[PDB]
Amino acid sequence: SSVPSQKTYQGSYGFRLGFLHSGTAKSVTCTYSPALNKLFCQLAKTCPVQLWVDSTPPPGTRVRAMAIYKQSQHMTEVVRRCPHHERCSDSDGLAPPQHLIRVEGNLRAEYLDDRNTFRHSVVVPCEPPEVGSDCTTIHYNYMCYSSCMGGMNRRPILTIITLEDSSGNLLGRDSFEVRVCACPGRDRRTEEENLRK
Ligand SMILES: [Zn+2]
Fold this sequence. Notes:
globular, 1 helix, Covalent, cell cycle, monomer, four-stranded antiparallel β-sheet, binds zinc ion, monomeric, Immunoglobulin-like, mainly beta, SNAr, 11 strands, Stabilization
């Protein structure tokens, strides 16, 4: 399948992602490494991602998330749940069982299977920040381990977040690598040490 662009693009509204500072304790379920631009998270745990804009986009703007393989030799392969997890009885009523990425706690989430590329994505309406806040947050879940056989199979993935208008045209784009693993704090520490070495 053709490969979606991963080029960072702030666009007219100054769109970019942000992440909370969670640390690398053994108790951490989700931690983001700025040095690696990489999120480490446990299976099906809440991953809060901040959406930042310099100016408010029009009503009907939406935010889409999609996973692609990071490595050149695999980026044409659709990222999907492995044969085991796609048959898990863990439906939330909205997400198709094949989709790796879910949005948690948003009843207006929509899930797309692209008719031409067959890629999966999940999209929600963009909303203005609440009273007293400067950004909005989306809660994502990753429903397969990076290591799952017959699925990601230890291959790294990227999540691409796109800001879109009501027709789906591109307004902004940002991305981050993801590792879904049992011990995100330990793995983030290891990979940051390797990068230093
Ligand atoms: Zn799996």
